[PDB]
């Protein structure tokens, strides 16, 4: 199929809430090798967010059950089911990380897109880290942190403090600190700095830019509140 | 694998909202050949309702898109056909379990009516997406399943029994939506509603917790429909 057929099928699948189909379509589009437009990037990102998100949600439910059951053949059942889900989750994440390495990051022609894909790399390694155990974990955590840190440096140099992607990177990187590295102090510092540097320039923004930026500023504000209360 | 173990996996899959896994577990349970407990019957029903429901929902969305549009209008049609095939496979799966295990093994009228209603239901889902020649034979199989359920429930169940009520409701919907015959639909729903209210006028207490809400569904269709 050509790109436009694949893109329209992805949009149909999105409407039909069939996200596995949606992701397969956009994976094929990505593999044609041309730099994605903002619309194609959005379709790809939304598709995989939903596909991996279903596994992350299921994983947390089954993990909780496994941990709250006076051992039995019950605990083993939950353990094995958890592992089945983890394998799906890892395959999904490896697929995304391969697209990032082979196509998305190399083809990114603008600082905005480059930061977006490095944040995305940080995110999907973070999802691997949520589920990693023992030997493999440290390595995975480092890969996440290095993607986020590189995204962070480029965004600081190239983007306005109120840019939604710069803000969104600060948000997810702070979540990484809080939750993966168990470093609350750095998580809160990161998030507060991004928030404060954005308010200091909020007068620059247009009516529409303002709405974009303030949505993510609210998320930084609310995470901070949650973590400092 | 142990039946009780499959059942506990079905419940795990349910909590994780993985309904395909849930259905696969209860299908294996059914295929072991023993009559299903009430719990097992509910888990099977709930699993396949969700599985087939996702496709029906997708099918309605993609059909609505296909209608509201020549190259895009045909892409939709071929996607819709992809969804139809999944849907047909799921329905045939269920209908085969009903035929091979559930209905012949049902030793109580309540279970037997439940499974025959389920047969009526899944042939109805097939009719929702059937085309041309095949549709009439599908529609007839749905109606015969409902009718058989209906005759048993009339003899063996109280008019306020939620399964008897749920049958009258779905059978009436079939007459209206599938057979486009609201004269038959209204008559059946009215008769069912009237018999249930005559019982409640007689007894002091409702025998089942959900009777009155299903009775409301019947009258609202009766009022909405003629």
């Amino acid at each position: 199929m050509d790109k436009n057929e694949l893109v329209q099928k992805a949009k149909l699948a999105e409407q039909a809430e069939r996200y596995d189909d949606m992701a397969a379509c956009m994976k094929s589009v990505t593999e044609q090798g041309a730099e994605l437009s903002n619309e194609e990037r959005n379709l790809l990102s939304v598709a995989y967010k939903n596909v991996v998100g279903a596994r992350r949600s299921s994983w947390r439910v089954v993990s909780s059950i496994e941990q709250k059951t006076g051992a039995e053949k019950k605990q083993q059942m939950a353990r094995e089911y958890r592992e089945k889900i983890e394998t799906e989750l890892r395959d999904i994440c490896n697929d995304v990380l391969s697209l990032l390495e082979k196509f998305l990051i190399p083809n990114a022609s603008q600082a905005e897109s480059k930061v977006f894909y490095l944040k995305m790399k940080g995110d999907y390694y973070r999802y691997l880290a949520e589920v990693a155990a023992g030997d493999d974990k440290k390595g995975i955590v480092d890969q996440s942190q290095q993607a986020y840190q590189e995204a962070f440096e480029i965004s600081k140099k190239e983007m306005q403090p109120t840019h939604p992607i710069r803000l969104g990177l600060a948000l997810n990187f702070s979540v990484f600190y809080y939750e993966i590295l168990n470093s609350p102090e750095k998580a809160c510092s990161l998030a507060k700095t991004a928030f404060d540097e954005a308010i200091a320039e909020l007068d620059t923004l247009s009516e529409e830019s303002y709405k974009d930026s303030t949505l993510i500023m609210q998320l930084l504000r609310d995470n901070l509140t949650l973590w400092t209360s | 694998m142990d039946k009780n173990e499959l059942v506990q996996k079905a419940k795990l899959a349910e909590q994780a909202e993985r309904y395909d896994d849930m259905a696969a577990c209860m299908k294996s349970v059914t295929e072991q050949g023993a009559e299903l407990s009430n719990e097992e019957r509910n888990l099977l029903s709930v699993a396949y309702k969700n599985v087939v429901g996702a496709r029906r929902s997708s099918w309605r969305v993609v059909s609505s898109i296909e209608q509201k549009t020549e190259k895009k209008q045909q892409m939709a049609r071929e996607y819709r056909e992809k969804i139809e095939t999944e849907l047909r496979d799921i329905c045939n799966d269920v209908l085969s379990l009903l035929e091979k295990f559930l209905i012949p093994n049902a030793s109580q009228a309540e279970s037997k009516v439940f499974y025959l209603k389920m047969k009526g239901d899944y042939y109805r889902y097939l009719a929702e997406v059937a085309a041309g020649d095949d549709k009439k034979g599908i529609v007839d199989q749905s109606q015969q399943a409902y009718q058989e359920a209906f005759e048993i429930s009339k003899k063996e169940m109280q008019p306020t029994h939620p399964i008897r009520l749920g049958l009258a409701l779905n059978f009436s919907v079939f007459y209206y939506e599938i057979l486009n015959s609201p004269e038959k639909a209204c008559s059946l729903a009215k008769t069912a509603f009237d018999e249930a209210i005559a019982e409640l006028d007689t007894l002091s207490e409702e025998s089942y917790k959900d009777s009155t809400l299903i009775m409301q569904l019947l009258r609202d269709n009766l009022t909405l429909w003629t």
Binding site: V46, K119, L219, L226 | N42, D121, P162, L169, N170
Partner: peptide
């Protein structure tokens, strides 16, 4: 339009969708 079957504050992370 209705048929029946009978039975016997987390932290936020964000995806940017730039138009």
């Amino acid at each position: 339009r209705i048929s029946v079957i009978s039975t016997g504050r987390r932290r936020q992370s964000v995806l940017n969708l730039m138009t």
